[PDB]
Design a protein around this ligand. Structure first.
Ligand code: 34Z
Ligand code: 34Z
Lengths: 499, 499
């Protein structure tokens, strides 16, 4: 094995005086040497306050040099961090820590009350009581490196039917979760590496593939506390960013800035632009190609298994192929891992549960047994093999629509309607109905000020590429879609509100 | 873990119909699918002939598609191949198999008698009785994949005082022995990969970093049964070679051909030229830069621990720095791993005994305990830290010369004398003597036809860069140097022949 801790420590010894963390806004830099000292010291101080290996500690913070120190220090201690989205509802967070049977929670958010008053046995730690603006608050004797087993829990990330599940990431999962950035994305070891921390740390990509990779390759992690497209493009040039991994939205922002930015603005050093673009619309992709530099690679992955597919220089966003570490198959929906589909027939994408795999969801054994089957991980996504020997992601099995014996993916239809003039957003659901089973229904929201009509949206679709049966049978023009705390559509529920 | 077998199998499933092996001379190609079938079938047939996991089998063959199949098939079975240099003396090979307590030996060499008559309990298998020109001889039912433990032995390579020691390479060592080609050398996963098999398979680089890497990255291994510089340069262009790892001699041959080859001869696709160039003279290096394309990377490594240092685009051959997976130190010669030297003081290079490390020499526990110390591997090489924070390899501790309290590395002096006009080869030894301890002595061999004199070689050195004390105190002009079966100088013994 090489654990996270080990990866980062060996790095320290290879490049003590090279820059590890940079918060350019706060005019802060730490070398690898300096960043080890602060992990060490915080680690000791949390241990001095009585808090042992294998104990789960929650982390609720937005991206900052301070939380990076906090998380590493916990792992260095031996505590198993459970990283949580700070945009979750107070209620929700308080719940997951209660369920999580967690010894403490480091927070930088208040929402503190929602916890202190959750009835949870969870010692509430203010983040700024540990470290703040780099140098931390230290006492206790330098503690020892605890033994770590390959399958022992190491970190806990959250996914999402009901409340988000808690995926346990074993110690042995770190390496391939990092190195796929190198085998797939083309990063190599070296002090030239300057990685821009745009992806949140509470996400496996933001943590393993961005933070950890950047450090473990003896490079520099550039901290970003708040995303602004121009400021970011400025960081690239100013910081010598060599690679960045960004969400489809981030990219759209960046590509348009770069376009309305002539070359002002030398993005020369940017060599890799990486993204999980299964859901990236065709339009955005190509503004990314036209307007941003460096090699673009498209990746598909999951919290459970990390990276499963990719495309260098992608033409579309849906169509990818497995790289190093991965093994994949497409099996009949609801059926044995061994039931590979014909070719051209759609099915569930499933991927080998090797070393990068999680070990189960904390305290959800049915959930786990729904997902880890005979040493395979079940994506719950629907794919098909292209005659070109690649995998086309069609959409989530859960969102699939079954309309008189036929397979309809709301996402396809959402991508066409999304371009109809006048449409600010759309979700396509299957109304519990007839023709039969389910009738394809479009819920669309107009651009500020503007009118839509079902007639006009139908003619638009009629003029479009969609096969007969895919066309919506019905439209509801709404002035907003109900979403959860995480800007994401309450599908099951929208249905109640329209049927 | 990811074992060799697993790496190659997962590849098979990602790229069944892509080309794995190519013997262009014999006009032979196999896809990954085809290459699995033949590993499977041979594996079964050796198992059918009664031969179980963990049993050591010797392999004595020059590079060929057939031996690649043989070796993989043994590992797939579960047998632990011990790969041996075919240029070893009949006597010598017969010995190492006796010592090795080996159940069988696959040979393609005769020298067969030297074994059949060695008194060894070693079933002699002709290679051509198993597989020949691709398709093999098959019987038995398809056997099962045996369980493999991370520290379980997996392969056995040979190094070299007396007879070469047998380094056991555990199952868990495969991955980083492959992936350092990607973190250091910059190879990424992909069917574009075309790797030229110039390095022999009985060498860890030839096996892990060349064969296995090429396959495991879903690429193509180009078989080379015999090295000819022009033929090779032709293979590059013709084969679309993307990378090659070659010995300092191979390179010299290739660089001179490319130079006396205009561009005839488009070496466009060659992107990585890699070598262990610690001993590469300054002249050759730079003909490699002037005359060969693609990125040049210099590596230092050992059988015991694989890759420990490297330089992208190297200026000299002696000066390198640790990459991903490695941890290194320079400690006082003969002393505790914890005795780091001052800075600028010379010492023994030692490297962390992590996952890529061997587990010991087969049946040499003192030897092992001389080499694996408190979880470090001891290179027995002498290095120094440059003020530039890099490691300079000076030479082997064993060849070091101690001349009145001073450290002299024969290799430095050998590099200067090697350019003196009229010198075809030179070795510098320390005569057991005075001034004291040891007197620096040069043994040189003239160019065909030519004369040398000590006077003239002294004036040459006098005109050269060497510091006072390094100059040879004595010359012996010899018309050959005694070498072992492996074209390498019998240092200890030359001394007898001159003193
Ligand atoms: O959540 C995802 O989309 C995701 C998660 C992990 C990885 Cl590696 C990738 Cl490429 C994507
Ligand atoms: O034997 C060597 O020189 C050697 C052995 C292994 C490696 Cl990886 C390298 Cl870079 C060199």
């Amino acid at each position: 094995m090489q654990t996270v801790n080990e990866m980062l420590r060996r790095a320290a010894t290879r490049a003590p005086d090279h820059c590890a963390l940079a918060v350019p806004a706060r005019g802060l830099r730490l070398t690898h040497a300096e960043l080890r000292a602060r992990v060490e010291a915080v680690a000791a101080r949390l241990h001095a306050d009585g808090l042992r290996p294998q104990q789960r500690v929650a982390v609720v913070a937005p991206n900052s040099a301070d939380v990076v120190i906090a998380i590493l220090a916990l792992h260095r201690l031996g505590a198993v961090p459970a990283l949580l989205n700070p945009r979750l509802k107070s209620a929700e967070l308080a719940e997951l820590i209660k369920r999580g049977e967690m010894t403490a929670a480091v927070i930088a958010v208040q929402v503190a009350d929602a916890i202190f008053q959750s009835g949870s046995g969870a010692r509430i730690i203010f983040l700024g009581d540990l470290v703040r603006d780099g140098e931390p608050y230290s006492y206790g004797p330098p503690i020892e490196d605890p033994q770590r087993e390959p399958a022992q829990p190491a970190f806990i990330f959250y996914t999402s039917t009901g409340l988000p599940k808690a995926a346990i990431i074993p110690q042995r999962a770190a390496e391939s979760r990092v190195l796929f950035m190198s085998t797939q994305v083309g990063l190599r070891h070296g002090r030239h590496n300057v990685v821009l921390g745009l992806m949140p740390l509470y996400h496996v990509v933001g943590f393993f593939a961005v933070l950890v990779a950047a450090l473990a390759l003896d490079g520099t992690y550039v901290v970003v506390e708040e995303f602004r497209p121009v400021d970011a493009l400025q960081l690239v040039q100013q910081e010598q960013v060599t690679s960045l991994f960004a969400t489809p939205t981030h990219l759209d922002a960046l590509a348009a800035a770069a376009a309305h930015a002539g070359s002002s603005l030398k993005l020369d050093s940017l060599r890799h632009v990486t993204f999980a673009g299964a859901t990236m619309p065709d339009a955005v992709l190509e503004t990314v190609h036209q307007h941003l530099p460096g090699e673009k690679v498209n990746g598909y992955g999951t919290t459970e298994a990390m990276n499963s597919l990719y495309m260098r220089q992608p033409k579309t966003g849906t169509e990818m192929a497995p790289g190093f570490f991965s093994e994949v198959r497409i099996v009949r929906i609801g059926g044995g891992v061994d039931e590979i589909v014909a070719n051209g027939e759609e099915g569930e994408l499933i991927v080998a549960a090797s070393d990068s795999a999680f070990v189960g969801y904390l305290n959800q054994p049915q959930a786990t047994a729904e997902k880890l089957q005979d040493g395979w991980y079940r994506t719950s996504d629907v794919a098909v093999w292209t005659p070109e020997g690649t995998v086309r992601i069609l959409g989530r099995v859960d969102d699939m629509i079954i309309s008189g014996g036929e397979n309809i993916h709301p996402s396809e239809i959402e991508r066409v309607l999304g371009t109809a003039p006048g449409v600010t957003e759309v979700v396509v659901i299957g109304l519990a109905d007839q023709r039969w089973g389910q009738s394809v229904t479009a819920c669309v929201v107009p651009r500020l000020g503007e009118t839509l009509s079902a007639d006009a949206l139908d003619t638009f679709c009629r003029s479009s590429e969609l096969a007969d049966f895919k066309r919506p049978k019905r439209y509801f023009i709404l002035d907003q879609l109900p979403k959860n705390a995480l800007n994401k559509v309450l599908r099951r529920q929208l249905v109640q509100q329209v049927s």
